[PDB]
Amino acid sequence: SGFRKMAFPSGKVEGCMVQVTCGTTTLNGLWLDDVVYCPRHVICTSEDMLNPNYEDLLIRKSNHNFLVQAGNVQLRVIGHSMQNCVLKLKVDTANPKTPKYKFVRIQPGQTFSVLACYNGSPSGVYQCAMRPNFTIKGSFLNGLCGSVGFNIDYDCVSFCYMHHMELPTGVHAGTDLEGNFYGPFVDRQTAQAAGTDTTITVNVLAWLYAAVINGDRWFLNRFTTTLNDFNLVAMKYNYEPLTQDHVDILGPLSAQTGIAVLDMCASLKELLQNGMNGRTILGSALLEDEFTPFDVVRQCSGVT
Amino acid sequence: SGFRKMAFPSGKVEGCMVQVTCGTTTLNGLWLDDVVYCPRHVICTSEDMLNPNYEDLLIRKSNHNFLVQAGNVQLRVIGHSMQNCVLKLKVDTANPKTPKYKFVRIQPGQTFSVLACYNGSPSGVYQCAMRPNFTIKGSFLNGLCGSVGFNIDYDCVSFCYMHHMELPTGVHAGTDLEGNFYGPFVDRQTAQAAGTDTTITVNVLAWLYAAVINGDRWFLNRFTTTLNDFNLVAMKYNYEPLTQDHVDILGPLSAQTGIAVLDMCASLKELLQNGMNGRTILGSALLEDEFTPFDVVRQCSGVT
């Protein structure tokens, strides 16, 4: 037993991280087959970042102005292009460590592992959720742009996120691997609003099931509720509305524990209205919303 | 900015994980040079585990009774021996992925990354502290024994932990790579007590510094204190006593923030006595003690 926020093993991704430099700006790129993907703001000076005209900036840059380095070894850049907010640098050498991969645009409420890297060197790994407002709560600094978020299904790496920026609230924003931002953000240094950060109700429920599975059950009350009833309470706390799809998705956990989803909702309702009274659930003193039902099943089942 | 519990990149360790099977018991082993290290209870049936005589059990086992598998490929076992609570299986093939490594016995209060593996297949990665009572709060199930805990310093992997068992409290126990338990535990299925789990005071302080660095400062009060004064309060809450060594270790963080260690102690004292009043610090509603000063510096500095 025990339940922990855990990231996917990062080995397959480590082997794809390179350092990309243009002028005095350095960040990370992702080397897959003969292409290196990186944030287009690698072409900006600190001045440019305030209001960059990327089309105009990129035109002053040739292949040889992009310095790409995997370990101590240079890659030869033989082409460049800009796709939305990412550059693709064609190199003359296919990464011999390229794993099977795809590019995916992840839905809000889903989770992924981030391999924090500094100027091409893997630094550490942790789990994030894509929040309903299309931000993540990460740990990023200068040099960590181009670090990627991914999931692994056996041998397939699904890349879903590349890091670009931080908002005034201290949360993080970035793109899929086609360079399209998650959320309304743009890659320039101006103040930008994410909007109200709502709680991922289905994830809270999953974690409450996790807790029950791992012996924590003090919060199981004698009440039930309905979706409409629970959702009237949800709105009040800026929880996402629960739908039947979410009910269905929790099916396996409901079965495994013998606790109806609406009974757990009633329990969640009393926690929201009455707080925790200084108690903890899976060693947290607030309601955790960054574990998906999959995340919970994967851990509690354990196998593979 | 932002502060996250993050594990070391796990690639170097992934390449050392193998599956060890003896009879119907399967678990993980660590393959370094021509040696595979695994928990000696791989030799037990479910019955034996209640009260195993390992010396007697091991004598019924020959080299060929240990099935060792890295991916789909068998290793040939050419020798076996028992060192404390681990078996060493000599194999005829040096692991070509062996990184530079050492074996270290970690101190209580220090942290490490765990690569959770299931029957030889890496599953995920997360950070643990070795608690003052020499337990860890992990996530482990059958099949995850032999999963290892480590730290990385540039290219050197320091292995410090191998997983063996779970205590009635749901916490975890294991050995160094010489097979010596952390704490008073033994590898048999009987009820065993860890004793009072004290809070790692120096780590709490470091995390409070992390918070200040990352903009959270509502808890900075107008008081100071002394070590003896603070330690009288520490004892009451089962915090570890603060010593000058801990003061010194916090030096870099004290300097970086301009907050004297004893001022932060005074702030910690008021948090202990008055609670959080429903507020959060780095998105937690309790006091976090699983980040070392190093962990905090490493993240906040970021570089390398």
Residue numbers in the entry:
A (entry chain A), B (entry chain A): 1 to 304
Sentences from the paper on this structure:
Mpro is a cysteine protease that mediates the cleavage of viral polyproteins during viral replication and is a high-profile antiviral drug target. The SARS-CoV-2 main protease (Mpro) is the drug target of Pfizer’s oral drug nirmatrelvir. The emergence of SARS-CoV-2 variants with mutations in Mpro raised the alarm of potential drug resistance. The X-ray crystal structures of the representative Mpro mutants S144A, S144L, M165Y, E166Q, H172Y, and Q192T with and/or without GC-376/nirmatrelvir provide a structural explanation for the drug resistance.
GC-376 is a veterinary drug candidate for treating cats’ feline infectious peritonitis virus (FIPV) infection. In the unbound state and, to a lesser extent, the complex structure, the S144L mutation led to a drastically different conformation in the 140–146 loop, as well as neighboring regions to avoid steric clashes caused by the bulky leucine side chain. This suggests that the interactions between the oxyanion hole and the inhibitor thioacetal hydroxide, as well as, by extension, the substrate transition state, are likely weakened in the S144L and Q192T mutants, resulting in an alternate conformation in the inhibitor crystal structure.
